[PDB]
Enzyme design. Structure first.
Site, mmCIF file in Angstrom:
data_model
loop_
_atom_site.group_PDB
_atom_site.id
_atom_site.type_symbol
_atom_site.label_atom_id
_atom_site.label_comp_id
_atom_site.label_asym_id
_atom_site.label_seq_id
_atom_site.Cartn_x
_atom_site.Cartn_y
_atom_site.Cartn_z
ATOM 1 N N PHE A 63 2.046 50.018 3.095
ATOM 2 C CA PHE A 63 2.263 51.016 4.112
ATOM 3 C C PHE A 63 1.820 52.364 3.572
ATOM 4 O O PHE A 63 2.014 52.640 2.386
ATOM 5 C CB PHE A 63 3.731 51.071 4.530
ATOM 6 C CG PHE A 63 4.199 49.827 5.213
ATOM 7 C CD1 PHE A 63 3.728 49.499 6.482
ATOM 8 C CD2 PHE A 63 5.098 48.972 4.590
ATOM 9 C CE1 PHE A 63 4.156 48.340 7.125
ATOM 10 C CE2 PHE A 63 5.533 47.812 5.232
ATOM 11 C CZ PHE A 63 5.054 47.497 6.497
ATOM 12 N N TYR B 116 34.597 65.805 -18.569
ATOM 13 C CA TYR B 116 33.715 66.964 -18.658
ATOM 14 C C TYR B 116 33.133 67.365 -17.303
ATOM 15 O O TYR B 116 32.657 68.502 -17.165
ATOM 16 C CB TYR B 116 32.602 66.704 -19.680
ATOM 17 C CG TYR B 116 31.423 65.930 -19.138
ATOM 18 C CD1 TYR B 116 31.514 64.559 -18.884
ATOM 19 C CD2 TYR B 116 30.210 66.566 -18.889
ATOM 20 C CE1 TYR B 116 30.439 63.845 -18.390
ATOM 21 C CE2 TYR B 116 29.119 65.860 -18.396
ATOM 22 C CZ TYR B 116 29.241 64.501 -18.138
ATOM 23 O OH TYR B 116 28.154 63.805 -17.644
ATOM 24 N N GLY C 69 22.925 62.066 -12.990
ATOM 25 C CA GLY C 69 22.061 63.142 -12.556
ATOM 26 C C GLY C 69 21.235 62.777 -11.339
ATOM 27 O O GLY C 69 21.111 61.608 -10.958
HETATM 28 C C1 LIG Z 1 23.253 63.101 -19.726
HETATM 29 C C2 LIG Z 1 23.906 61.875 -20.298
HETATM 30 C C3 LIG Z 1 23.901 60.706 -19.552
HETATM 31 C C4 LIG Z 1 23.688 60.813 -18.057
HETATM 32 O O1 LIG Z 1 22.849 59.781 -17.625
HETATM 33 P P1 LIG Z 1 22.017 59.842 -16.241
HETATM 34 O O2 LIG Z 1 22.317 58.533 -15.532
HETATM 35 O O3 LIG Z 1 20.553 60.029 -16.577
HETATM 36 O O4 LIG Z 1 22.472 60.972 -15.356
HETATM 37 C C5 LIG Z 1 24.100 59.482 -20.175
HETATM 38 N N1 LIG Z 1 24.294 59.437 -21.549
HETATM 39 C C6 LIG Z 1 24.300 60.598 -22.299
HETATM 40 C C7 LIG Z 1 24.512 60.556 -23.786
HETATM 41 C C8 LIG Z 1 24.105 61.818 -21.670
HETATM 42 O O5 LIG Z 1 24.100 62.988 -22.388
HETATM 43 C C1 LIG Z 2 7.847 48.935 1.422
HETATM 44 C C2 LIG Z 2 9.122 48.187 1.733
HETATM 45 C C3 LIG Z 2 10.141 48.166 0.774
HETATM 46 C C4 LIG Z 2 9.883 48.727 -0.624
HETATM 47 O O1 LIG Z 2 11.092 49.202 -1.204
HETATM 48 P P1 LIG Z 2 11.144 50.223 -2.482
HETATM 49 O O2 LIG Z 2 12.228 49.810 -3.467
HETATM 50 O O3 LIG Z 2 11.425 51.667 -2.026
HETATM 51 O O4 LIG Z 2 9.786 50.128 -3.158
HETATM 52 C C5 LIG Z 2 11.383 47.613 1.123
HETATM 53 N N1 LIG Z 2 11.617 47.096 2.397
HETATM 54 C C6 LIG Z 2 10.612 47.126 3.348
HETATM 55 C C7 LIG Z 2 10.819 46.594 4.737
HETATM 56 C C8 LIG Z 2 9.375 47.667 3.018
HETATM 57 O O5 LIG Z 2 8.419 47.671 3.999
HETATM 58 N N1 LIG Z 3 26.902 64.146 -17.747
HETATM 59 C C1 LIG Z 3 26.092 65.114 -17.009
HETATM 60 C C2 LIG Z 3 25.011 65.781 -17.867
HETATM 61 C C3 LIG Z 3 23.681 65.347 -17.246
HETATM 62 C C4 LIG Z 3 23.732 64.148 -16.552
HETATM 63 N N2 LIG Z 3 22.487 63.890 -16.062
HETATM 64 C C5 LIG Z 3 21.648 64.918 -16.447
HETATM 65 C C6 LIG Z 3 20.272 65.150 -16.222
HETATM 66 C C7 LIG Z 3 19.680 66.299 -16.743
HETATM 67 C C8 LIG Z 3 20.450 67.203 -17.478
HETATM 68 O O1 LIG Z 3 19.824 68.336 -17.995
HETATM 69 C C9 LIG Z 3 21.799 66.981 -17.698
HETATM 70 C C10 LIG Z 3 22.398 65.817 -17.176
#
Ligand SMILES: *Cc1c(COP(=O)(O)O)cnc(C)c1O
Ligand SMILES: *Cc1c(COP(=O)(O)O)cnc(C)c1O
Ligand SMILES: *NCCc1c[nH]c2ccc(O)cc12
Ligand SMILES: [Ca+2]
Ligand SMILES: [Ca+2]
Ligand SMILES: [Ca+2]
Ligand SMILES: [Ca+2]
Lengths: 476, 490
Positions: free
Chosen positions: B84, B335, B357
């Site tokens: 698509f 935190y 995040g």
């Molecule tokens: C920032 C932080 C995360 C958060 O993970 P996301 O899913 O990318 O938001 C996980 N582990 C650590 C050690 C972090 O500092």
């Molecule tokens: C394109 C399509 C997807 C693809 O999903 P993503 O995880 O965003 O790549 C899922 N369902 C339908 C019906 C689609 O046409």
């Molecule tokens: N535990 C929150 C801190 C966090 C989590 N996910 C992130 C993405 C980018 C960033 O700078 C900090 C952060």
């Protein structure tokens, strides 16, 4: 006759966005970091339903300036000291802008060869910077490595897909009829590991009873004790459970503790458990030789992830997952099946532009100067006996607090807790700082995360003066 | 002294990027849609190692133009006709650029109030355009929404919520009962749904792919779904989740949402509607019937990054009870604690997704709607559909071809008919004539076409709607199809 990508609109809309960005960086320090809005403020500013007719882009930008920007928390502010800063750069923004405009979907190599190869290239380049072994690399100088990588959206996604792969491997090692044996698999991490990891365990279907949070204490600076890990994994093995996965963290969120990677891999090897190293924040520092010892033993783990969108000047999203020896799971592709979703945007372009435009030496100096600013702040805290630094500073995060006995208003350790909370709220109300807290060994503690991209050493010194001034008028 | 966001660099890097985008759109039609490179070409041209020292951004842009662009598949080309189209707009590009530069992380409302409140507003606006029942929107409602990156994540978080509710109410001892849960989708459901089932821990033996046939235009037959769920319940399994698709990836089949919800309500199964592509068309009244019955489903997702002019990534998930999602996805790390979250008056969107995040994706979606408005979005859907209608009627007027299924939106499925010439006497011959027509179209660089299998037959898809694409690009593509077909016959 309506053309959404016509040449005039593309040039004038993007030029207005660029103008806004220039002004925003020039003036963001003059704004309060934390906004003074209550929940629901926006729906009282903007219309309740989408407009029937079109408006000039100027109208849209004016509402961005009048109603969006004032309700934002300015991560870009040099006075943002919270969480981990989302460091950024002109090359990263440019690369994400170009990716948005090309707007390709790289769910196969054929669906855009340059995008797949650039993401493999970006990952192999960063792996060299981190001095990862060849077992984590797709291509080498003249041949192939034995590993691979993929650029994910979050560290959480990295945990999920490696949890799922360890789960399916342990299900087959233990002769499980499909998922029928899943209630015997156990997983392990220190209690300082991010709570999103234990959530990832539950998403992958592990049993709440078998998800182990290993207690840590101050006698290891809250790093995982390998003896405690072995005790827990041995007890589960003796009880008939299957130790499946261990997460070691290099640079925990709360206080930047470091788990001993090599020793954790040695303990898990007794049970054939998968070992994942989460270095979301501190991984970036490990491109510098004086921090690379923190990853000693990585050659014996199964996977490792880190996030350039924290401390390597690349805007969100950009999490890099590396997997050892991918044969256990001429063509050139990333580990496309180790994502949540098959098709997402071209995230490698900005990571490559960062590396290509600035080079290794400047990325290394970016890490070192952030650490040096954090050391300046730590030594200032250590110079005022009303305060304490509660754990050793490993990277660019300092944890400090008003200690008990700093004044009559901090006589007991519970009074110190409320004094530190009061200090944090007073700092945030000035608009010249955003500080947020954590709890370390039962004590309310302020975090100070250095490294916001516009932030300079005088901003950190000025924050320390403000902390001193605020504390002083609190103690009357 | 090294300042990556200094004002000089920020202005000139982005101006160079805009100049590149300007050139790119003006010249992309003249490039071949598919590249002519071999695997591994890139690290040959750029190097195997990153550079030690810095380089002017002009060099980065030159390597972009010389080594990256010649190896791209040009989704933005007016001659891209596969999968698509990834429709885009100046406003969405501008919104994402601004979000990338502010670079806020909105895991909680407090972490940036405007990022979360605009995402809610943008979801509410889109819900109004779609005429979603108010039960999906948000003072006693429980409905609500979240922008995610992918349909896969939307399927994943709803599968997890359905799984946890089924385990709870059916008396599982922890996850010991997970091998007893079953899930259902038509065989036309996108393969990412079956992958999301495996990620959530569903047993592969219990993931039911219901056969569909030409009798229902390859939509899910609700009688056959009832048969499959009743059999499973009678065998002691727990029917847990049903996925209905509106606008399937292969041939744009449409499942009957109401009847599917009614079948699944006999088992208290979760019903999710995947409208990734075709959901955008439902902002038009003449297409909104395809969602009738949605007021009785548990969740629906659709992707503005397919057909609503919003660059990747942007997928919208709506649920009738956010509490069933946050019950499985919420965390409360110390935190992150703040007074707004404690009050219960905000939804922290980390509790609606896998990760912590998240980018400010609401901005680009709001900017599209705010700048262009509903009527232009509607006309954008309608004029893509009319271009597909033009192409469909051109196919119908040439006896050598057949339209394989009825056309519901802007994707036409068509085929060199069996008995059209010498190179297509039998159906096995037609299958190979279509594969060669496809590969020859692609070699010219004036088309990109990819195939599917409809009822055991090799079928070409023609997905109209690339943003730069006009009606003469579609007519010229048809002329190129006829021309290549005639040369193939003799
Ligand atoms: C920032 C932080 C995360 C958060 O993970 P996301 O899913 O990318 O938001 C996980 N582990 C650590 C050690 C972090 O500092
Ligand atoms: C394109 C399509 C997807 C693809 O999903 P993503 O995880 O965003 O790549 C899922 N369902 C339908 C019906 C689609 O046409
Ligand atoms: N535990 C929150 C801190 C966090 C989590 N996910 C992130 C993405 C980018 C960033 O700078 C900090 C952060
Ligand atoms: Ca070579
Ligand atoms: Ca810095
Ligand atoms: Ca809550
Ligand atoms: Ca169009």
């Amino acid at each position: 006759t309506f053309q959404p990508l016509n040449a005039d609109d593309v040039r004038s809309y993007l030029h207005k966005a660029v103008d806004f960005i220039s002004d925003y960086y020039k003036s963001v320090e003059s704004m309060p970091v934390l906004p003074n809005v209550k929940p629901g403020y926006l729906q009282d500013e903007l219309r309740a339903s989408p407009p029937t007719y079109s408006a000039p882009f100027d109208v849209t930008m004016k509402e961005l300036r009048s109603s969006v920007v004032p309700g934002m928390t300015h991560w870009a502010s040099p006075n943002f000291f919270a969480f981990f800063p989302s460091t950024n750069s002109a090359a990263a923004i440019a690369g994400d802008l170009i990716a948005s405009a090309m707007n390709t979907v790289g769910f196969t190599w054929q669906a855009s060869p340059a995008a797949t190869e650039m993401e493999v290239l970006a990952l192999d380049w960063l792996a060299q910077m981190l001095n990862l072994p060849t077992s984590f690399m797709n291509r080498t100088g003249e041949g192939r490595g034995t590993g691979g990588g993929v650029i994910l959206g979050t560290t959480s996604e990295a945990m999920l897909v490696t949890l799922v792969a360890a789960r399916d491997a342990a299900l087959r090692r233990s002769g499980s009829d499909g998922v029928a044996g899943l209630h015997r698999l156990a997983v392990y991490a220190a209690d300082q590991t991010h709570s999103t990891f234990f959530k990832a365990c539950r998403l992958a279907g592990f049993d709440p009873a078998n998800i182990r949070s290993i207690p840590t204490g101050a006698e290891t600076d809250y790093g995982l004790d390998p003896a405690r890990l072995l005790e827990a994994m041995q007890a589960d093995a003796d009880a008939g459970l299957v130790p499946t996965y261990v997460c070691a963290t290099v640079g925990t969120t709360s206080s930047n503790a470091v788990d001993p990677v090599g020793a954790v891999a040695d303990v898990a090897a007794r049970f054939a458990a998968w070992v994942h190293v989460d270095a979301a924040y501190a991984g970036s520092a490990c491109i510098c030789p004086e921090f690379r010892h923190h990853l000693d033993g990585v050659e014996r783990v199964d996977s490792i992830s880190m996030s350039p969108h924290k401390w390597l000047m690349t805007c969100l999203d950009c999490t890099c997952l590396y997997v050892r020896d991918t044969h256990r799971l001429g063509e050139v592709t990333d580990l496309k099946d180790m994502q949540v979703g098959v098709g997402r945007r071209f995230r490698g372009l900005k990571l490559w532009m960062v590396m290509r435009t600035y080079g290794v030496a400047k990325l290394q100096e970016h890490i070192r100067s952030d650490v040096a600013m954090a050391k300046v702040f730590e030594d200032l805290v250590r110079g005022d006996d009303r305060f304490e630094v509660v754990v050793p500073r490993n990277f660019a995060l300092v944890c400090f607090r008003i200690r008990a006995g700093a004044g009559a208003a901090a006589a007991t350790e519970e009074d110190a807790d409320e004094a530190n909370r009061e200090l944090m709220e007073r700092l945030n109300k000035t608009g010249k700082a955003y500080v947020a807290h954590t709890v370390v060994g039962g004590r309310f503690v302020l975090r100070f995360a250095v490294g916001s991209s516009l932030q300079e050493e005088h901003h950190v010194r000025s924050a320390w003066e403000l902390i001193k001034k605020t504390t002083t008028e609190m103690m009357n």
